[PDB]
Amino acid sequence: QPRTFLLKYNENGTITDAVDCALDPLSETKCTLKSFTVEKGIYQTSNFR
Amino acid sequence: SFCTQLNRALTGIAVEQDKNTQEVFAQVKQIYKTPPIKDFGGFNFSQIL
């Protein structure tokens, strides 16, 4: 299905992890920040429609 | 990320508007009550209470 993934690559160019954004707002936050680490706070990632 | 930055800026402002209020009023974190007995010499404090 067409879905957005945040893909983290290593030195070789091999994807080592991925976040499928359309799961839970934590995954959207990772996708919004462009980071796999999300720390304490409040985020706006989306506004459901 | 241009749209994302516009969105973040607006959030940044929302957060600032509440700190602005906190700094003026909530700089004293103790809630005091009004005088129970009214005796201010010749003064009448009922109009600012």
Nearest Cα of chain A lies from the Cα of B18 at a distance, in angstroms, of 15
What is the Cα–Cα distance from B2 to B4, expressed in whole angstroms? 5
Q: Does B5 touch chain A (CB under 8 A)?
A: no
In which region does residue B35 sit, left (phi positive, over 0), alpha (psi from -120 to 50) or beta (all else)?
beta
Residues of B in contact with A32 (CB under 8 A): 4
Nearest-CA residue of chain A relative to B11?
A44
Amino acid occupying residue B28: V
Resolution (in Å) of the shown entry? 4.2
Q: Does B30 touch chain A (CB under 8 A)?
A: no
Q: What are phi and psi of B42, to 5 degrees?
A: -90, -5
Element (H, E) at A21: none
What is the Cα–Cα distance from A42 to A4, expressed in whole angstroms? 22
